[PDB]
């Protein structure tokens, strides 16, 4: 895989870091260096924010009609689609993601999401109000201004567009800080945005480390809003940094411990295939991965046997190979962390059914893992592993499983497998999670808002809701004289 | 039962008709005269429209804030609740409706629907637009003006408020023409509206005949909008009258031939009790009555036996008696029409399972009727009977029953009885009817819009949609100069 | 100008009329025959409705996701943009419209409007309701089905897309009946729709006469909705035809008698230039043309003199010539009708200031006309002329001008020229017209709903409102069990 | 004035603090002790949160229909209205607020705002989505859960209801921590809520100090959301406390430095009376007080003379006296802080036009103060004083004044005084503040959202927006089978 975009993207230009420093990105297949990327720090973020400030305050982008920003975003989406193979290859080498899924789903899904916001750009509405005095009131929806985005490594393309798509459609100027593990595709997008007609300073990309570049975005006095996706720990630092700088609003997606509930009436093969998909997609490196599987007692035993057969059949290997179902973990730290959690599961008394060990000659490959006899307060039942590890459990009643599903500090997503309308309605309304997937999984859609409850964070990505977070509501009021109606 | 309100209500006053004429209202229990009511004609409608015109053009009502119209409507709703016994008694003697249901459901349901619109009155919003030019655009929601309402006899109170509630909340002045069979409660409401603080000319009630008073409302040159509920035939006359007068928009609720579909997986006792409820409530005198019952072959035989037991045991008699489940038909014409359809049913080859004959010494009482071996092309399977008559049929497949459900001129409502989520979703999306009731029936709610497809008419009653039909949308646009965002 | 599309477009094919008959389209520049077009009658409309019925009931179009219908409409909009010169030329020869305006505004404005609906296609929302019982209620937005569009000759492209854009985005199948005077561009669009991927039977175009083909669409038993733009007289026949056939809902845009109000604080040159634009654009052949000009007494005299100078400077001639400001009237009937109205103005005592006579050797050219000393009840002050004729009047007070502006049976649009915020708010809220243009004119926008009050008709074209008229609202309700919240 | 409610209100009961401790509330008119109030600390907040948790998790309140919560809130609003004199008297003695304004505006305005949310309770809607797959998606609006409210002393009643009204309407259980300076009316409301039928644990009121009780609410592990109104400094502490506890979302109203811009074309007497009203209402103790007055050069000199006349004649004294226009500052700290800013104003070179000194024998009375020759970089032009102090300045151009208006850390509200439509539109769109009041001031309305930009905070109080912050959006998705439309 070739890398042509390695510098920072500030003010419509690819530039080196002020320090002249570079950091390395590694391929999880081998641990070998892919490329050396310019290492942005506080000085580079300051330059990107100044570029974003100039583009918003005096530049053409927010002054454009919504229709003309949409036309530019539609051209940007078309360019993504023409570089689909190169973009998927970049994400496969940077993050260990399956190339076939990158081409078929991930990269076109990003272009599709950017089309959704491009189509929303000329349809943004405020309200005309109903005053309880002889006055005319209305609200204006205005771009927030300079927005700072801090993004993780698991879905580099997807996360980039969840943030960039709605913010740019709203008329904002952005500074994106991609994960140190995955800076590649974000620099390619900065190049495509420029080609599409996105003006200089509207999209700034500052690759670099978290406590340096990432913290500089969160603490910036001239950034109006920050949207952050990543760990619960860093989410606390981002929220604190906003409080101690300029009181900028913040939106956070902090991961979860997603339960999947399988009832007695489920089709066994469908439910096994669905749970396998929920747990092992992207080597378990997803904020919404099925992690706690609750299977009703009537089908429990047959489910365990089928889940074990299917997991052990999974082809683990080179993500570029189309016969491969599971690639390596992102890097060494993640790989080692998943191994520690697997050891924890064994140490606390859970039963290892399949996997639970690394595989292959080289690379960060871990066997799809199933633990049974998992108790609700166990570490593997409470902590986000972010790896190919399932906690398989049994339940008797609906009331009992609702309590189990909600026995977590998280609340991002949940899966329900049942044919009964009443069970589906009772369970979906009772689980404290932002997204409920009934007889499907990872049912993300550009039109559907996505965001957590509890420690999964707050604010939405996707849907019209995401567009609304990059718009301020301004109330304007004037008295009325001789009105024939009120 | 005593009648104290017998005159027309025009310009905040109870007045006699210009002609001095009166018509009689009869008790369906005996055919006896209840009271003599002032008979409004074209001259009285002209006086009511002039009163409504003055109240809208120069009066305080549309000039009030939404909050202050809401406070008056809240007072109006409270007054309804304090006169529940008297109001229910009036609708029983006038329409042959059950007194216990009047007190428990019908009359408080009207006060409740009035509170829903009172609460919407101060929350009406238009939009601020997203112009594709350097312009500021917005929409204003203004009261339509003078509204004419033509209502039927089946739910006198309910129909009155479906129309009056949203129109008064919006700031309109109304002219109500109640059915000749049921003018009583509408005059009591005109008295309560005045007591609540509804200004003179805002709510006018002109009891009288259809081709005289009703036609005068539909054809009026100074009525801005008309809402009609009743027969398909008259609906054609109302729509035509609007076209040949001032091109006022209309909304029409024209009744239906509602199917109820019972699948193999339903709880038989629940399904039987639900269908019995759907077919026989208010002696079948409902636009949404369950008329065509489709029962899947696996449970068909047991369903027929159980449906016949419930229909045959049903207590037919005095609607004032709390042990009575079914009162008399509204009047002689309706009673005779139901009897003609029962006779056509027999002559066309259907099987009479139960009823199919009048009962009692006096009054317009008809036995709950079940016909089996009903073919889709039969008159009783195609025409609205508006009586206690069920057409009970069998089906094998989902695809077959979707076609059967849609094999009608109408599209008002449909019932589905199944526990399976997928069947419920497939069937509900496939039936061309405005309201789909899954595992329930008559699930009307102030927040839920109600209106037909096909020959059942167009426009909505109930929900925020009903409020929207009494508001005009006015687009206002001005250029913008030196805007820092667009 | 070359004509390559002359046949009917039924079921994705260009076909001759069942009768084999053809009618001629003439060029208003000469009165010479442009082309012979297949003459559709009741038999051809029946074939188009059957094609539309098959495409909706069993075809892929409504089964597509909103996103995929949008992608097809975006391709359709791109194709319009690449045939901009040919399309403008067709509209110039068929309707006598300025070629420079066709290329710069009319044709790209249509492609732009189709992009607006393409972008709305994947964002259509219903509601989840707030039930006052232990129930879950929601609304579904479903395509209405087979839609019939009857369109006038004044803006052939614009009118076509106002109707087709939202109906196709919603998932409907259409039968368009273009005006006999302007069938050309509509057949070119049918060809472009097919090229874009619009499936067979989704867009049917039946050129032909009004009482034959047009009446056949309005009276069709299998058309679910009709949208009509044209004369008040025909609007009555369309509404009546719906009432006497299947009770299909109807939306009507019936023309107007638009007032423009100029206050004492207006910039004289700006207001004169604005009024000149409002009155004479498209030779006065617009439903929203400035027809009644009210100028405040303080500036009245200077306004008349300036309006006369400017009108007499107007270059009347060949619409293909870029130096020409005003083309010929559509045809002989329109030309003669405008001349009769000019004679009426003189006959009833109005003062002819400029024009009021035909000009040139050949073609249907009429001089821009100004009448002063126009009284409010005069025929030229009350009737839609649809020609280059201004009724210039004086007023003293705001209260007086509000009454004058509303002294009409129409209510489509109005213009206000003032710098004062309070006058603008009082006047805009008091004029009973669907569109208020403050210090601008013809401020149409894809995001702004457009539709009349009073005899201008009802229903909206443009904005999200237009999309809503091709969608039915279906209420679906189910009970809830053990819900932790309601 | 008598005080009957002095204890904490936890779990539907008036209880003493766990410690048995009490704190004193003083009358700003004398510095005299009014009453001794139970002093809530971390232990009492823990008991209130447990009561709120029980009421939400297992209690009837969120299980009620929206309509039934609305009926209780309507009863609650009626009770407020019957105790208006007593309620106003309590806020006068506690906050030094005018008694006449309490009775006429403040207390009935709270009952009115409570009616607005009661009316919204049965109308809360989510959406049915437009999926880009063969799936059915929808959103549910569910109560957030347990909500903590931290309120200031300036508008005790108003602030209480801005928070409590929408949160209770949404189905939440609340813990309110009123300001130590103003705990009185909040305990009276807790008593009225109970009387109205608000269930035990739904509304808890914990009077007490900020770093103790207030910090305990902000840092609570079982509080789902927090709303804070007060100083910027504490706002940082609240946001940080959320980040370091459970990552609960916050909303913050942090005050401002509101500019009022008077253009050359304003009616001088109207503009002067409006600015006087904006600056001195509630002795300048308002987050939206007019603080920086910018007057255009053409009228500057006459404005200063007229503003000084009105400020100097203003009746300062007993807030119980109806002839009094300005009461004392809340307490000693506020009084001393205003005096320090007056001294900084003089020391930094500003010109004292009037006031600038304390008045009277006893009480915290400060003379209405005007400073001229105020430069944009001065402390009195940059810091929120929260006192009767005006910074009166001159400007030449629109562009200049837009920059001056935005030369602040804050962005809460701004006033514009002009008759010109274009200046009003340009200026209103250009000022970075949440509320723009044109030719009026303090134009708050239950239907109008209110919230700041920049360092004034984020989130809205009032309008439907306030209701939305107490509702979670849950996305629910299921596949579809054999759908005839998508
Ligand atoms: N859809 C409904 O809710 C509903 C209700 C009652 C009756 N109906 C249908 O109608 C049958 C009974 O007929 P009906 O005479 O009672 O109904 P109808 O349609 O004649 O009467 C409904 C209302 O319209 C008025 N009306 C009658 N003729 C009119 C005219 N020419 N112009 C204007 N208004 C006119 C009536 O006075 C009454 O107020 C029933 O068997 C049933 O099929 C439907
Ligand atoms: N924005 C507003 O509406 C508003 C209102 C009142 C005061 N203020 C500002 O604050 C100044 C006065 O300061 P103040 O002490 O009265 O305001 P404050 O910010 O200290 O108090 C507001 C509320 O927060 C509570 N609080 C205080 N310290 C807390 C802490 N550590 N954690 C949690 N809650 C805590 C208080 O008890 C009170 O209920 C004024 O001069 C003005 O600038 C702003
Ligand atoms: Ca009749
Ligand atoms: Ca403090
Ligand atoms: Na990497
Ligand atoms: Na009767
Ligand atoms: Na022609
Ligand atoms: Na006090």
TrEMBL record, chains A, B, C, D:
Q: What is this protein called?
A: Aldehyde dehydrogenase 1
Could you give the subunit structure recorded for this chain? Answer: Homotetramer.
What keywords tag this UniProt record? Answer: NAD, Oxidoreductase
Q: Keyword Transcription regulation on this protein? A: no
Classification via Pfam families: Aldedh
Active site at 253
**UniProt xrefs under InterPro entries:** Ald_DH/histidinol_DH (IPR016161), Ald_DH_C (IPR016163), Ald_DH_CS_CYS (IPR016160), Ald_DH_CS_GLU (IPR029510), Ald_DH_N (IPR016162), Aldehyde_DH_dom (IPR015590)
Q: Which reaction does it catalyse?
A: octanal + NADP(+) + H2O = octanoate + NADPH + 2 H(+)
Cross-referenced SUPFAM superfamilies, in alphabetical order? Answer: ALDH-like
Q: What is a single molecular function from GO for this protein?
A: aldehyde dehydrogenase [NAD(P)+] activity
Protein family according to the UniProt entry: Belongs to the aldehyde dehydrogenase family.
Q: Please, which domain of life does this record's source organism belong to? A: Eukaryota
- The encoding gene is rf2c
Which PROSITE patterns does the entry mention? ALDEHYDE_DEHYDR_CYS, ALDEHYDE_DEHYDR_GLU
Where does the Aldehyde dehydrogenase domain start and stop, copy by copy?
15-476
